[PDB]
Ligand binder design. Structure first.
Ligand SMILES: *[C@H]1O[C@H](CO)[C@@H](O)[C@H](O)[C@H]1F
Ligand SMILES: *[C@H]1O[C@H](CO)[C@@H](O)[C@H](O)[C@H]1F
Ligand SMILES: *[C@H]1O[C@H](CO)[C@@H](O)[C@H](O)[C@H]1F
Ligand SMILES: *[C@H]1O[C@H](CO)[C@@H](O)[C@H](O)[C@H]1F
Lengths: 483, 483, 485, 485
């Protein structure tokens, strides 16, 4: 067996936009993401699938059932977000010089929070309180995340921006968004601190900026292709994180972290070790050096330094890189760039999403973060698109084993949160990518236990990979699978 | 949910030759099957795999572990056999005219049984008693089968017969085998009746005669191709069953049945309904009409009539048939005649063994037996060769659902015994075909729970297909599988 | 045997941007498409493959070898374009009210043509003459097409437009492009009429507008997502075709047609026949009714300056599109036609190409006879072929489609040739070199050409003017069992 | 370009039982193989496919069409056999001590030959003359092989032997068969020497003995599993070859060889080179050392009646066999060579044929040079080809193997021809018609022959006496990505 520390918790992560809608009364039409996926031109271009989030798994109405299942599964931790748009669907009065590049301080106090209180949707706040109370009643430790991608439409009209019109609400391209995010975060902590155990400011800010402004074939808003604007967005989100951290801490003593998208960078040949380091710099360290050490572009900002208590490690697979004349390149046929339901260039099985099976990468990522920063971590996201459940038992056990490995090596990792408890709306891809331990019938909203959920119950209730399921710490046999 | 009657039991079936060997001290070299799979010429021809049963899962030594797992899985019934060869490894004195075609009576009494007692291996008998006592101690209802293919070498030297030499011990071609089988059966019932709940005389006698003397590419002993001898073998096994029934009943009041190999015969087109009936006659009814109604070739034998209390239904898949000028033919590309790890001509997924997914056939088979004979049934064998466990969750739930269907239609079915609890020696195919709910590491003899074992625990402990696993009542998705 | 009329020609089609570059001195850096495929942001987004056209098959320098192989193969017809950008790499003098929606006339006269001649690249012009003379010397009948997608950069900066900046040269969004295209076409006809047998104005205008402004994941320039601008571009392209027809006709008596991208619209169920007609309307008839009948929407009007501007129709065809009737109209279905997985099988169990396109030769018969019945204009099959580096499917694809043209003629359709796409592998736009459509395989390192077995099959057809008895079995679906699923 | 010597010939090989039947009046019901494939028990067991040879490609009646296509293809060599059973359908008079293990001499003289002539079927003899004359009239050099597996029923009742009854005619288990084969071969040479260029005694004797008496799942007659009888059959076949060589030589001066089944033995790891040599010994050298050097085991002796009975070696080749060193000796590995899944990929990632045979052309170079270096006898590649109905892989298979023969010659090996298996599809023994090895596809309903694209490729090779520059790319592995795994 592989036994975890007594304090270690197994659970799940989920997002508001992806899971909340589906029950009549739950509709939230007031985000950039909602408008984006309903857009006729985006649908015709195939940038979005045409599936709509209001036809989703219905966590807004059915949360007690989700929680019932999580409890039966032996889970002890959950991480979810509040949707900004639900709490503040209407524009807030303008506060602050918008032409200033840096946002070093956002003044938050009791009076300001009472003023914000008057714009807040009380029905939305009360409902979230009901969800979170029910969550805590099952003995679930609660990580509350402030942000998981959709912005209020009054802060970002993504179709205007897609069209090249920058005179409207411009999302992360505007310091107004940074200012309002800091206040939103302080406000939520103020309202919910009695229920929350730890905070995250944001989920995967690197994906928001990266796919929003460079990876435009992904169909992420606002889908405006610009290196310059991607950099500006990331610059803003970094300061938003730091200001949100300060805002939360002005109101709470609880740990405040961030959740980030990772790949394990791997060398094509033994000549490519430098390529790996350059990739890690460009994709990971530059960001964390900013919010931990205050280092940015090369200066040190005192308002950025030390704004992090913990690191949420999201992980699916590797990225294979090679050294190039001018720098380095990532290789197709490995990691996330494989054919769906097939095999990679290395002979490893790929998911419904085309992502290569590579659990060793998780050990790489956890130990690299640990060695650089010595901040404790949660694995906040890890799972596989697999409607049939063919690969998930192996994927689950293997990755959980790698976490045990990391801890054994000395890394402080305090939980593992699978993505996800149930199937949900996979962004531009729609519902077809199914990541749940529980299968959702979207017609009836009924939840079913895939056999991997039974396997996860074994792990969670025992606090260990037990002897009986240890064989699942292996690669899914490829011979019976599609090539 | 699909709830079963309160008296219905879920369990497993297994065979002595397939599961017993593997622990030092368990070796039984004294059968036709042992000699057959060790034969140099058979190995060179590829009639046998070259794997050997002494390297098996080790139930002889490790039975307590098997039983521990079965108990944890919530199982309430088991069917196993004693190996004739273990109890009587040495030739018995000749009794009886061997040239007589019919064996209508075998006189068994207390003195004769005490005489047999003096030739019996007491170590073998005591060990089986220890296994069966431990079995009963877990609350397992016990079906004891007398015969599951291997014969003592003193009754059959299969290599002599393969070579066309009929002067030696000739197995089912000899009425001496019939006579000794009746006595063996009476003797075992005499010794074990205190532990046994129900009896079976034999497992799949149709496969012994069919593959032994016609399907010679299967590598079953003695592999001598002859329509005439196949008929003679089946004739003898039928009378052996009837004489064993009488022998058991002379010593016990408990139910005595038989376990038989079935396919669901299915028409290629709507013009092939007569073909199905002819196939069912030729493969099923002729045999059961003999031992139930005494009808044979067309006379009635009073010594054959009524020798059956229950029917063990084994089932894996369908056989598709078409009407022909002269009669009917079975079609390749369906049922058991498909490519391994692929899809049939109908687009249905196939197993590691090349057998097509067709659970509807089980309902067909159970209701056809019920309507003809009105004898109660157990599903004594059903499962899938699937080392990866990709298809087994679906295969398990779907077939269990079909049993529920049969009962709902009025058929008296009293249990479902999966083939098998753990991986075992698959005859001429060796170890590569893995049918276990538990995976065996043959190097260490350790047992692991495949996720289907967790699913089966849900069914067995609840006496139902529960709401949460009901989605597994469906075909494994073929898109992610090999074609 | 399936024998074709004595006058019927078998040949090939090719494009300048896709095949010309690759030999020293052949580079043409002056198009929207060139800039588009070299753009760092496009490359990082994966909108373009990162392959570059200047590493291509080298027709500019190696045309004699291409033609040698085509002659050996028994081909008797070729359709090729001149690249606008090579002839006019620098801007021409502004002439004309740019705010006017319609362009009903573009006056061109001998003096105007002589002025244009002062701005033309003479090296480019003379090189094209050398290519075309050599082509004619092999006995190849010549269809000269004026346009096959790239515009001179001085008429379209696609990166600016991608970024949502409409102050620069805006390609088909501007009537200046329409005006200049008319002049360009008249000019090329004026210079080359002694070498040309028939003319096409454009290749697949519907793809330029459709992928440029709606199907933006395809990585076609300028990749600015707008229903309204797609319609504006198509409106301009339609008037550019008409103005180019008049321009050519001012200078030549030879037939002038257009080449257009087609799929065969097929009903999912027997309840979807109306869906097919609606898709045919929206994808095909609306365009050809404008340039043949002068019918258009601006309400529904007849423009006398558009009516009758077409002598022949170039039918391009790869596969079907399966459509189903919807509440609000119709939709096309994934898993059939060009929307399949690569090297696999469609939802109907038909094999797919390296490009993910379904094998459906029957669709060519559908398309040819439908055009014939509507307009009664003679046709050439101007593009038909398959992405297939291995040559597994191409022998079947070639024979089967050629058979369907024989079928169409047999039904009464006037079809005068079949031009395979293509003689040799070439640069497949945003996909780069990996999609190989050649009868001949190109080694891009040496520029050497190799005969795939399908090329031997094509030689049998072309030399005999028939699908001969010996290769008739190839009129069938490639066996799916040995192929990838 | 890879050019062959001016004297080198490209052609094909074919067998009587596999190709002759299919036309009215061509039936030959009088062999062990005929009885074997019609046997109800064999069919029910699946030992044979249920397909029947009398529904075959019809060479008996359609030989002129076969030859027309071969001439069109530029072929210049053919190897064919006479079926013993057609010439002597009824038993000959018993001559000779059957209990003697060795047959050191078989006296044949003109008077004996004239007596044999009284028993021969004259219609069969005259028909074969008509076939062979027509063959020679196309300019095809003729290798006549005497035996390609089926024996007259009066010499072998395989069902009786399958059943373990050795009292009847027992085929290669009897020295009577050896004696009669010698006479038969002398007789055929005596009758046909004016038409024949070179002779082979037998085709693949190692398969007759190996699959007949050990590899019994293959469904070859008599399918009686016995190491001891396999050795006895091989011993007899060896002396039958020697006696047939002397018999032919008594009547002709022309070269007399043998055709043998080969695989290239390859080491799994660098530690397995000894395993290869042991496999080469056991599968190849033991046989050829007997008939060339007279060395045999009965202990290890030299028989003067066996020594030197070979002028040339016919090299048959499909694929490799991978072997590994074992405690007790060596073993061959599944998942490589002929032990792969059909239409898939081997453990090494190499594509497999419709028969499950791995693509490994390098093995042909290995086999040819090894024979050359051991014996220094000239060779023909007498059999090489692939089961491939779709023709996906055959173009690569053909070009690549032909290249490896060019390689062997270049290294100094005397190789005088390459004969593809086969010109047309035919009856593949226990597998029936489903395994299609033809350059030409046969429609078994009409008996019509179609040229697969590989046949066009072969015509390029044969007419040029070279792999030409244009098809040189086919000297490569069929791309695996678009194929089934
Ligand atoms: C992490 O990845 C999963 C799978 O793509 C997404 O659904 C989550 O929103 C993202 F946070
Ligand atoms: C029923 O079938 C299974 C799978 O072939 C065998 O292992 C059993 O012995 C037979 F009874
Ligand atoms: C017709 O289609 C082919 C293949 O997509 C393109 O290469 C041509 O440029 C287009 F005209
Ligand atoms: C050589 O091999 C081929 C293919 O198995 C057979 O058809 C020939 O008869 C044999 F000589």
């Amino acid at each position: 067996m592989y036994s975890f520390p007594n304090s270690f918790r197994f659970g799940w992560s989920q997002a508001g936009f992806q899971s909340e809608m589906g029950t009549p009364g739950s509709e939230d039409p007031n985000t950039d993401w909602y408008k984006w996926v309903h857009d006729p031109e985006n649908m015709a271009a195939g940038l979005v699938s045409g599936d709509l989030p209001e036809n989703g798994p219905g966590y807004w109405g059915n949360y007690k059932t989700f929680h019932d299942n999580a409890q039966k599964m032996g889970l002890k931790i959950a991480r979810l977000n509040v949707e900004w748009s639900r709490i503040f669907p209407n524009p807030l009065p303008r506060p602050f010089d918008e032409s200033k590049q840096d946002v070093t301080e956002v003044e938050i106090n009791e009076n300001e929070l009472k003023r914000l209180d008057e714009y807040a949707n009380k029905d939305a706040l009360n409902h979230y309180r009901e969800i979170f109370k029910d969550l805590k009643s099952r003995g679930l430790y609660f990580i509350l995340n402030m942000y998981h991608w959709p912005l209020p439409l009054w802060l970002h009209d993504p179709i205007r921006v897609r069209r090249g019109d920058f005179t409207g609400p411009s999302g992360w391209l505007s310091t107004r968004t940074v200012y309002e995010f800091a206040r939103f975060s302080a406000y939520i902590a103020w309202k919910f601190d009695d229920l929350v155990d730890e905070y995250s400011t944001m989920n995967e800010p690197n994906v928001v900026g990266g796919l929003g402004y460079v990876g435009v074939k992904s169909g992420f808003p606002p889908g405006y292709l610009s290196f310059e604007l991607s950099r500006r967005a990331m610059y803003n989100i970094i300061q938003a994180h730091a200001r949100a951290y300060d805002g939360i801490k002005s109101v709470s003593k609880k740990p405040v972290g961030i959740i980030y998208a990772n790949s394990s960078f791997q060398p094509l040949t033994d000549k490519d070790m430098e390529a790996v380091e350059m990739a890690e710099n460009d994709n990971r360290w530059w960001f964390f050096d900013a919010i931990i050490r205050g280092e940015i572009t090369k200066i040190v900002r005192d308002d950025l330094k030390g704004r992090l208590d913990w690191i949420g490690v999201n992980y699916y697979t590797r990225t294979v890189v090679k050294r190039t004349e001018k720098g380095y390149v990532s290789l197709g046929g490995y990691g996330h760039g494989c054919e769906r339901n097939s095999v990679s260039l290395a002979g490893l099985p790929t998911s419904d999403f085309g992502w290569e099976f590579f659990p060793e990468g998780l050990y790489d990522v956890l130990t690299k973060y640990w060695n650089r920063y010595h901040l404790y971590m949660y694995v906040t996201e890890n799972g596989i698109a697999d409607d049939a459940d063919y690969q998930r038992p192996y994927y689950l056990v293997s990755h959980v084993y790698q976490v045990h490995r990391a801890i054994n090596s000395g890394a402080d990792v305090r939980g593992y949160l699978h993505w996800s408890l149930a199937d949900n709306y996979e962004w531009a891809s729609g519902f077809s990518m199914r990541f749940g331990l529980l299968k959702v019938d979207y017609n009836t909203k009924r939840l079913y236990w895939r056999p991997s959920a039974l396997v996860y119950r074994e792990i969670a209730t025992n606090g260990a990979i037990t002897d009986e399921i240890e064989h699942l710490n292996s690669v899914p046999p490829v011979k019976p699978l599609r090539h």
